[PDB]
Design a protein around this ligand. Structure first.
Ligand SMILES: NC(=O)C1=CN([C@@H]2O[C@H](COP(=O)(O)OP(=O)(O)OC[C@H]3O[C@@H](n4cnc5c(N)ncnc54)[C@H](OP(=O)(O)O)[C@@H]3O)[C@@H](O)[C@H]2O)C=CC1
Length: 176
């Protein structure tokens, strides 16, 4: 009922990060005003969900500014991680149907935003639990990197919306 949406910025080579998990390619390229505005998307979200890698990247890179304080956060790991005792975060593991249902509830009928990364998104997809994708594409190939959706087997999707920006950047919504 509440949808698992994977909202993610990707290279033409289908990488969400460079091999050393950097993101210059994106932060160094101006998107343009014509781009669907972040708040318009976030407003449709009452739950974020992610992996151990993406989390450590927000904490190391933005320590005193969590970006999802509005909403409950799920960080996937099989480790013994803790977060700042003020922040709204719950560490889960194992199967993804169970995680999904937990995540959907906490969304309170708004959508669950799979922030990433690939490994994690792949995990949900592998379980048929991932529903739609929102890829902003940057006009560049980095050659090697963090796979956007490393599924075990081929995932058929259905283009639903597609914009091209004046910047050469590109946005598209796809349904599983
Ligand atoms: N817009 C964008 O382009 C975005 C880019 N990124 C980039 O992506 C990078 C990380 O992506 P990526 O490395 O592919 O993967 P993830 O961020 O998903 O992290 C992977 C880790 O998630 C844990 N995990 C995943 N699924 C499960 C499960 N079912 N049960 C238990 N643990 C689980 C494991 O950690 P453990 O060791 O703890 O078991 C696994 O190693 C970030 O570093 C960032 O650079 C990230 C988000 C958005």
């Amino acid at each position: 009922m509440s949808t698992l949406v994977y909202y993610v910025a990707a290279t033409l080579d289908g990488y969400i990060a460079t091999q050393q998990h950097k993101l210059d390619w994106l932060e160094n390229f101006a998107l343009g005003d014509d781009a669907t505005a972040y708040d318009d998307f976030y407003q449709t979200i009452g739950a974020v969900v992610m992996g151990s890698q993406t989390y450590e990247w927000i904490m190391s890179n933005a320590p005193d500014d969590w970006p999802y304080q509005d909403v409950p956060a799920f960080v996937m790991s099989n480790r013994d991680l803790s977060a700042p005792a003020n922040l709204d975060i719950t560490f889960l593991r194992g199967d993804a149907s169970a995680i999904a249902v937990r995540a959907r509830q906490a969304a309170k009928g708004k959508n669950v935003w799979l922030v990433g990364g690939g490994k994690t998104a792949a995990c949900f997809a592998n379980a048929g639990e991932l529903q739609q994708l929102f890829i902003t594409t940057i006009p560049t190939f980095i050659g090697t990197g963090v796979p956007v959706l490393p599924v075990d087997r081929a995932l058929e999707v259905v283009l639903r919306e597609q914009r091209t920006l004046q910047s050469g950047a590109m946005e598209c919504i796809l349904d599983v």
